Amino acid sequence: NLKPVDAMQCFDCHTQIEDMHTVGKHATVNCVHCHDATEHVETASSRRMGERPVTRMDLEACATCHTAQFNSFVEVRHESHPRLEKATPTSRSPMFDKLIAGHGFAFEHAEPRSHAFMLVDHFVVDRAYGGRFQFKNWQKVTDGMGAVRGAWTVLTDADPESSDQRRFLSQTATAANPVCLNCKTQDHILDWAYMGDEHEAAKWSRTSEVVEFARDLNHPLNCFMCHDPHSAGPRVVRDGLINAVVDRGLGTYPHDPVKSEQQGMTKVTFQRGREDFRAIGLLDTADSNVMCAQCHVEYNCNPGYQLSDGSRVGMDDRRANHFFWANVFDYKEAAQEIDFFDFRHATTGAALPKLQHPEAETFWGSVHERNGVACADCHMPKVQLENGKVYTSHSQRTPRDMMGQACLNCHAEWTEDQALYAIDYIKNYTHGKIVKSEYWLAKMIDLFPVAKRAGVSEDVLNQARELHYDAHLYWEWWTAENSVGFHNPDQARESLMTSISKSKEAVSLLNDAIDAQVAS
Amino acid sequence: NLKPVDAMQCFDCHTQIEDMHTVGKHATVNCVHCHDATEHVETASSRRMGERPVTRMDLEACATCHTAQFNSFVEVRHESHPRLEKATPTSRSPMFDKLIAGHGFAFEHAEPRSHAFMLVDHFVVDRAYGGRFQFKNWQKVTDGMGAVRGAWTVLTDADPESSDQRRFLSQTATAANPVCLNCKTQDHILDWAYMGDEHEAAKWSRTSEVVEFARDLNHPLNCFMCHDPHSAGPRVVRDGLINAVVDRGLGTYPHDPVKSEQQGMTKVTFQRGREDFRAIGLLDTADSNVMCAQCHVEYNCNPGYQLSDGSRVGMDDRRANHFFWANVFDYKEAAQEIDFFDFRHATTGAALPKLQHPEAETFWGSVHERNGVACADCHMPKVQLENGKVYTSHSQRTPRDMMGQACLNCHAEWTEDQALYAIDYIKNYTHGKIVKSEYWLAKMIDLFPVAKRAGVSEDVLNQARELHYDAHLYWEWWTAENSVGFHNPDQARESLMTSISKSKEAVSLLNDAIDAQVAS
Amino acid sequence: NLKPVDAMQCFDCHTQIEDMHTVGKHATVNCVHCHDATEHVETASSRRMGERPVTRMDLEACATCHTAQFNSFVE
Amino acid sequence: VACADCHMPKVQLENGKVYTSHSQRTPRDMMGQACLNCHAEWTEDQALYAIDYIKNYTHGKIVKSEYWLAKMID
Numbered sequence A, B: 001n002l003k004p005v006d007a008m009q010c011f012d013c014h015t016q017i018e019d020m021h022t023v024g025k026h027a028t029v030n031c032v033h034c035h036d037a038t039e040h041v042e043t044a045s046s047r048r049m050g051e052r053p054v055t056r057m058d059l060e061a062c063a064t065c066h067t068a069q070f071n072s073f074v075e076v077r078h079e080s081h082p083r084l085e086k087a088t089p090t091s092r093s094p095m096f097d098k099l100i101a102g103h104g105f106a107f108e109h110a111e112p113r114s115h116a117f118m119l120v121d122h123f124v125v126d127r128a129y130g131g132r133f134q135f136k137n138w139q140k141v142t143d144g145m146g147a148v149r150g151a152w153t154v155l156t157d158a159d160p161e162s163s164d165q166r167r168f169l170s171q172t173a174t175a176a177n178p179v180c181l182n183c184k185t186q187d188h189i190l191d192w193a194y195m196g197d198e199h200e201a202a203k204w205s206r207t208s209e210v211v212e213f214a215r216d217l218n219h220p221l222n223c224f225m226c227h228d229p230h231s232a233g234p235r236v237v238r239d240g241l242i243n244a245v246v247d248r249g250l251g252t253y254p255h256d257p258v259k260s261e262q263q264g265m266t267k268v269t270f271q272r273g274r275e276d277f278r279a280i281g282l283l284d285t286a287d288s289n290v291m292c293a294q295c296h297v298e299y300n301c302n303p304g305y306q307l308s309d310g311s312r313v314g315m316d317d318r319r320a321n322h323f324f325w326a327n328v329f330d331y332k333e334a335a336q337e338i339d340f341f342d343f344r345h346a347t348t349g350a351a352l353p354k355l356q357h358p359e360a361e362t363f364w365g366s367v368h369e370r371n372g373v374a375c376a377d378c379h380m381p382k383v384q385l386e387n388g389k390v391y392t393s394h395s396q397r398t399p400r401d402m403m404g405q406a407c408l409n410c411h412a413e414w415t416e417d418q419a420l421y422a423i424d425y426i427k428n429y430t431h432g433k434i435v436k437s438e439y440w441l442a443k444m445i446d447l448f449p450v451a452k453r454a455g456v457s458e459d460v461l462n463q464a465r466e467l468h469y470d471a472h473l474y475w476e477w478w479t480a481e482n483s484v485g486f487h488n489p490d491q492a493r494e495s496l497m498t499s500i501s502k503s504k505e506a507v508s509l510l511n512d513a514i515d516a517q518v519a520s
Numbered sequence C: 001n002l003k004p005v006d007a008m009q010c011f012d013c014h015t016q017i018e019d020m021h022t023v024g025k026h027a028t029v030n031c032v033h034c035h036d037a038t039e040h041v042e043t044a045s046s047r048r049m050g051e052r053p054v055t056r057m058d059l060e061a062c063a064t065c066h067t068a069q070f071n072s073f074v075e
Numbered sequence D: 001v002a003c004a005d006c007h008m009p010k011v012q013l014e015n016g017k018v019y020t021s022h023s024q025r026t027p028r029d030m031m032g033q034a035c036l037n038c039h040a041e042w043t044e045d046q047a048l049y050a051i052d053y054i055k056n057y058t059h060g061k062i063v064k065s066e067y068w069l070a071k072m073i074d
């Protein structure tokens, strides 16, 4: 059985923790629930760690006292189709392969499924580790609880003796790097310096061998990514987000300084050897928009290239761990700001951005956001009980599964069918515009080989390539973003119309140029 | 009312039948249930047939004593979408037309539906008889029982006065030949010599006019295709399968000689005029894998061409009735073995195989097969009754309709939702790889006209054509095979990755060559 | 917010509770969850109760850490 | 077997930390956990039928007991 330790003794050296722990709603929660610090206490000095204490990162460390939130979190939504490739005609991006050609996502980009699987899914996706990691067998793909208990209880490593990224299956890529992990797990929260910068106290950084790093990681979406385990207060731990909101002074709501101030973030730094090591962001309120923005944002988490001169930006560069913290219409400017793009299109040669699930940045300025609605309101609402102690659902899922709590309490004028219809109206419309944007992107892309081969000049090709950047941006945001427009219908519509415009302009440029080459 | 005949009198001339009938569980079943042999008995000698007895091939000949299995067999699964074309974006092969161009399946290839309709569906599909046979009206498409009772109770013939294969509708083909029928019906089991070889005692052979042959045929999937009507013992009657397993010594489980020996096949031959005429394969066990392999395999049942010199292989050639009895990774070698391919791709000019529903060969070596699971376990399991005499379901259908009996008895760790999720994980993943393989096939195929027109050399074109064979093989197996990977997920994945690799290599070959032609 | 009390001090007079508490699965659960003993501790000796400490009998005292059992119970 | 087995059984979760239900109620509401895990030979309806056979029979004897008690009392 657990035996409590003397927290006062800890507090003599751990004044930051004391200040947090003694004041919050974990004041009575003994350190032994999450730390085995016996050898540590025997060996540490006021500034030297001595023996490293054991810190539990497993979610069951919170499940003993918070079973309801734990069981609700680990629930698997079987209706969320698993391993479902987005580049298929019945999914999000029917022409994805043509449009993303040149990028590692061509190897596999599946729809998201339940949070329990984020880490294992990160490990086994075809684009990530050369196929090195696989479920032990195809039965394990169902095991949400197992995945939560640890990725390595359900996965195998094709070659435990090597640690290099390489291809074990022919049609895989090795795009995983250590930055990715920060949106999958925070098991490494004590082993990773802020931003993944080199640091004498960090086991792991942006430049680590990601395969070795992966082997050290177990748990998806740790409960403490949103809840400080010492104060039990709301926080974020994602470096990239703290960096955008606080270091870069952009605010939690970059479009709204008042709301930014009311619902702010305070960066708290923890040191190793009296050097800054890691940081968390304590939230003024339990603001799920910002909690979810730890991961549901457009980011760099990868090497790239400079827009200016095309030189490699490696993992060693800060820009490999970056939250643009910009909506779709400020994105190009934000990418220019850091002088960065992701890949050159394999057919057009255009330098292109790669967009990632920008739900947070899409949600800004939308009607629900302006009305003070947050992600949790639609995606993890309070449970309604005829008789019971209320708690917040932690099953982050479509509102379709809980329409009464997620929509209809606020929308009393609607039945469930009407609320669903309103969603489908926006998604249907938006998806039609996505598909039309892809049609036009594909039409332009197919003209590039024709133009090159007809001898169209590099100047025209480059003009078309510059158009491709925008056509691509204003389309890809929306296949990347998971609400199919619902989070911001007007913005989706304007963006997708811009994409089609850009592609149409490029098509007409390329067609005329080809025709002039043929007539000459 | 039926009157029994003296079986002893039959047995005086029919010693093989006597040996089978007197020992099995049909020992008390009088010949009159299936034979009207009165004139026959008056006219036959010990070696000459005399007057041909009537033999009932209808399934109702078994339904009198086996109603439960009969009614379960004729059940129509309305949820199995009928006449649903596979070459559509919402079905199995969104780019099928481009990829199969040159082949008669371009005219129509629908998803399979319930067994009751196999014969009528064979007759009316657009690729088979030039549209000569149609349901009498569009209402008849529902009538499973009618179809079972006889194709000609529900179909019409556009021109009863001619017997040539020709087109009555513009966009049809005439690919049907007599070999096809062997996987639709065995009404002709006494009129067809083994393998469809010419034989003085055969009304029908590989070279018959298939329209005349078709008119003689009524019943789908006769009950006796798996059950010897004399011994009631398990058997196969499909010549092509007996030929692979026994004549060619490949075994019932070509990858497993031990299992092949334990679950073997004994070829029994029946003679006409003391010449070998027809054959059946008696099974050591009631092994549904091998029963279902009568039809659910990759086969030749058509004319083709030789890989070596491109000369026609006609219906007269044995190779027109062939079971390759090879998995996807041994297939090319098996096709080389008989020096055969199906069609030249209409755009690339590549010689290509045409793959048919290879469920049996896919299933080999899969985890379920290695554990001794068989088709019937998932697709026609025993019925569970609170109170009743157990019998085997004969409704051969997706396990989704009976998950408790088809999966969950064996998978006690799963709920139905979890079992379904595991299936969908594999199918989603596999289908994404199918779609990616088609993307790459299509990209390569589209380069062929560009390459030819840019003056790329025949040597390079032929190199690309050789790549096309493999790209095609390693893709088509999986749109042909009906489990969308479920029967063998690892093999689907490796094959589809091989297909994409092959296509990518061909694309790069063709692109470089085109570019060099343009630069010159 | 609950402030933990010094359980060891309670245990100086409460050896029978000490033997049960330090050993079971509530060894880390502070007395403050179920007792308000501030004035008790100011006035008691080992042989004189002093001010009667408050003991919580409400089921919510357990519900903060065992919500699932509590909610299942109250259905 | 103990009361809890039929009246307060462990909750079965596809994914989750198991705990003991504290809703003390008839097994009819949770036959899978309260009876069928032990009685794998039965469907829910069969288990319910076995309960009702006993309850119906016993209630008949309760009613007859009352009939006779009432007759004596009168």
Ligand code: HEC
Residues within 6 Å of the ligand: A005, A006, A007, A009, A010, A011, A012, A013, A014, A031, A035, A037, A038, A040, A041, A044, A045, A046, A047, A048, A049, A052, A053, A054, A055, A190, A271, A272, A273, A274
């Ligand atoms: C003698 C002083 C001292 C004592 C007492 C002390 N610590 Fe530490 N501890 C340190 C120092 C120094 C570090 C390194 C970080 C820092 O410098 O603040 C550290 C680091 C840690 C870490 C981070 C370890 C990691 O992997 O990065 C944890 C967790 C921790 N302490 C917990 C505890 C607990 C729980 C107690 C009481 C059981 C305790 N400490 C008592 C000095 C102390």
Ligand code: HEC
Residues within 6 Å of the ligand: A007, A010, A011, A014, A017, A021, A026, A029, A030, A031, A032, A033, A034, A035, A055, A056, A057, A061, A062, A189, A190, A224, A229, A230, A270, A271, A278, A280
């Ligand atoms: C409910 C779980 C839990 C409780 C209880 C808990 N900790 Fe922690 N602690 C964590 C986790 C998880 C981390 C990793 C850093 C983070 O999440 O911010 C951590 C990190 C730390 C660190 C490292 C801060 C740094 O320098 O990076 C110290 C020191 C620490 N804890 C001390 C304590 C002390 C002292 C107590 C007893 C008062 C305690 N913790 C109780 C979970 C817990």
Ligand code: HEC
Residues within 6 Å of the ligand: A025, A026, A029, A030, A033, A061, A062, A063, A064, A065, A066, A223, A224, A227, A228, A229, A232, A233, C028, C064, C065
């Ligand atoms: C030993 C019991 C215990 C442990 C273990 C535990 N908690 Fe708590 N937690 C509590 C108690 C007690 C409260 C306060 C209940 C109340 O008064 O509302 C609480 C409150 C919270 C709150 C409420 C914050 C608020 O202001 O409403 C959050 C969030 C929370 N815990 C998260 C966690 C996390 C995350 C973990 C794992 C890192 C964890 N807890 C582990 C006992 C525990």
Ligand code: HEC
Residues within 6 Å of the ligand: A108, A109, A110, A111, A112, A113, A121, A122, A125, A127, A128, A175, A176, A177, A179, A180, A181, A182, A183, A294, A295, A296, A297, A298, A299, A300, A301, A302, A357, A480, A481, A482
């Ligand atoms: C800024 C946080 C963040 C970064 C960093 C991150 N992801 Fe993700 N990831 C997400 C979110 C949010 C989802 C679910 C939404 C979605 O997929 O659109 C997701 C989903 C996934 C999935 C499931 C869906 C799919 O695409 O197949 C995989 C696999 C994945 N990520 C792999 C990676 C890889 C590999 C990297 C590093 C190259 C990475 N992630 C980096 C936030 C992140």
Ligand code: HEC
Residues within 6 Å of the ligand: A059, A062, A063, A066, A069, A070, A073, A221, A222, A223, A224, A225, A226, A227, A286, A287, A288, A291, A292, A376, A390, A391, A392, A393, A394
């Ligand atoms: C993605 C961020 C996030 C993560 C990770 C997270 N929570 Fe929460 N949690 C929330 C939000 C949002 C609330 C509701 C805050 C509010 O509105 O008061 C909440 C509330 C809570 C509370 C307060 C009581 C309640 O239910 O409202 C507890 C306790 C809690 N969570 C425990 C956990 C546990 C245990 C885990 C790990 C299984 C976890 N949380 C992970 C976002 C998160």
Ligand code: HEC
Residues within 6 Å of the ligand: B007, B010, B011, B014, B017, B021, B026, B029, B030, B031, B032, B033, B034, B035, B055, B056, B057, B061, B062, B189, B190, B224, B229, B230, B270, B271, B278, B280
């Ligand atoms: C339940 C139906 C049924 C029963 C009863 C039955 N038969 Fe048959 N018989 C068939 C069918 C169907 C065929 C076609 C060949 C086959 O299925 O193997 C056949 C074929 C034959 C043949 C042809 C074998 C050959 O040379 O090709 C003979 C002879 C024969 N039956 C004799 C008998 C005799 C004698 C009896 C009485 C003991 C009998 N059958 C009872 C159904 C039946």
Ligand code: HEC
Residues within 6 Å of the ligand: B025, B026, B029, B030, B033, B061, B062, B063, B064, B065, B066, B223, B224, B227, B228, B229, B232, B233
């Ligand atoms: C006049 C009644 C009758 C006829 C007609 C009939 N059967 Fe049977 N069948 C039986 C009887 C009786 C048994 C043995 C029942 C038992 O003992 O299990 C049997 C057994 C079987 C078995 C069981 C084999 C085994 O070893 O379990 C199969 C398969 C079978 N019949 C198929 C057929 C087929 C196919 C037909 C039509 C070709 C047919 N029967 C027609 C009466 C009939």
Ligand code: HEC
Residues within 6 Å of the ligand: B137, B138, B139
């Ligand atoms: C008011 C009477 C009536 C209505 C209502 C009706 N039907 Fe019919 N339907 C007929 C008649 C009469 C025929 C032709 C019958 C015949 O000649 O055998 C027919 C023919 C058909 C056919 C064959 C068409 C063809 O081209 O051969 C189909 C399929 C069919 N009906 C389906 C339906 C469907 C489905 C509905 C409901 C959507 C429907 N019918 C409603 C009377 C009706």
Ligand code: HEC
Residues within 6 Å of the ligand: B108, B109, B110, B111, B112, B113, B121, B122, B125, B127, B128, B175, B176, B177, B179, B180, B181, B182, B183, B294, B295, B296, B297, B298, B299, B300, B301, B302, B357, B480, B481, B482
């Ligand atoms: C080796 C046995 C076999 C051969 C011979 C055979 N089929 Fe099939 N057929 C099947 C099986 C098994 C299915 C159901 C599985 C599937 O369609 O993928 C099927 C399904 C069909 C269907 C329904 C699905 C569709 O494709 O529209 C048609 C029509 C059909 N076959 C026609 C033909 C034609 C025409 C021939 C001769 C050129 C032929 N079959 C030869 C085994 C066979």
Ligand code: HEC
Residues within 6 Å of the ligand: B059, B062, B063, B066, B069, B070, B073, B221, B222, B223, B224, B225, B226, B227, B286, B287, B288, B291, B292, B376, B390, B391, B392, B393, B394
């Ligand atoms: C595709 C091959 C196949 C066909 C065709 C077939 N069966 Fe069966 N049959 C089986 C299998 C497999 C079993 C179960 C054998 C076992 O496991 O004992 C079976 C079992 C039987 C039995 C034994 C009792 C039982 O239900 O388990 C009878 C009787 C029977 N079938 C009758 C029929 C009838 C009548 C037909 C025509 C309606 C038919 N069979 C067609 C495969 C077939």
Ligand code: HEC
Residues within 6 Å of the ligand: A137, A138, A139, B367, B368, B371, B373, B377, B378, B399, B405, B406, B407, B408, B410, B411, B419, B420, B422, B423, B489, B490
């Ligand atoms: C007659 C017993 C039985 C049947 C019925 C059965 N399974 Fe299995 N299945 C097994 C066994 C044994 C394994 C391997 C177990 C192991 O090695 O861990 C397995 C493995 C699997 C796997 C992993 C396959 C792989 O390649 O790793 C999946 C997925 C699966 N089963 C799903 C199903 C589905 C879905 C059904 C119903 C359609 C089903 N099973 C029916 C016994 C069965």
Ligand code: HEC
Residues within 6 Å of the ligand: C007, C010, C011, C014, C017, C021, C026, C029, C030, C031, C032, C033, C034, C035, C055, C056, C057, C061, C062
């Ligand atoms: C989770 C609730 C809870 C916790 C924590 C708790 N108590 Fe109690 N305590 C009770 C309840 C309820 C009673 C009433 C008697 C009973 O339930 O046995 C009680 C009774 C007592 C009594 C009276 C025993 C008697 O003589 O009848 C003492 C002394 C006591 N507790 C001391 C403590 C001490 C000291 C602590 C801190 C280590 C503590 N308790 C922690 C709930 C709690």
Ligand code: HEC
Residues within 6 Å of the ligand: A028, A064, A065, C025, C026, C029, C030, C033, C061, C062, C063, C064, C065, C066
């Ligand atoms: C501050 C949080 C907290 C409070 C308040 C709390 N408990 Fe617990 N309880 C725990 C923890 C932690 C465990 C140990 C979990 C584990 O390790 O299994 C536990 C364990 C238990 C167990 C399982 C004991 C065993 O031996 O299996 C029971 C029963 C229990 N508590 C009842 C209660 C009761 C009744 C109350 C109200 C009088 C209560 N708890 C209040 C945290 C709490």
Ligand code: HEC
Residues within 6 Å of the ligand: C059, C062, C063, C066, C069, C070, C071, C073, D004, D008, D018, D019, D020, D021, D022
């Ligand atoms: C009528 C007696 C009874 C009462 C009253 C009761 N429990 Fe339980 N409790 C049980 C039983 C029985 C178990 C299961 C013991 C076992 O098999 O391990 C249990 C188990 C537990 C456990 C251990 C974890 C688990 O769920 O198995 C906790 C914690 C718990 N109860 C909390 C509570 C809370 C909180 C209350 C007040 C709402 C409560 N109990 C009231 C009988 C009771």
Ligand SMILES: [Ca+2]
Residues within 6 Å of the ligand: A080, A081, A111, A112, A113
């Ligand atoms: Ca999803």
Ligand SMILES: [Ca+2]
Residues within 6 Å of the ligand: A298, A299, A300, A301, A353, A354, A355, A356
């Ligand atoms: Ca990006």
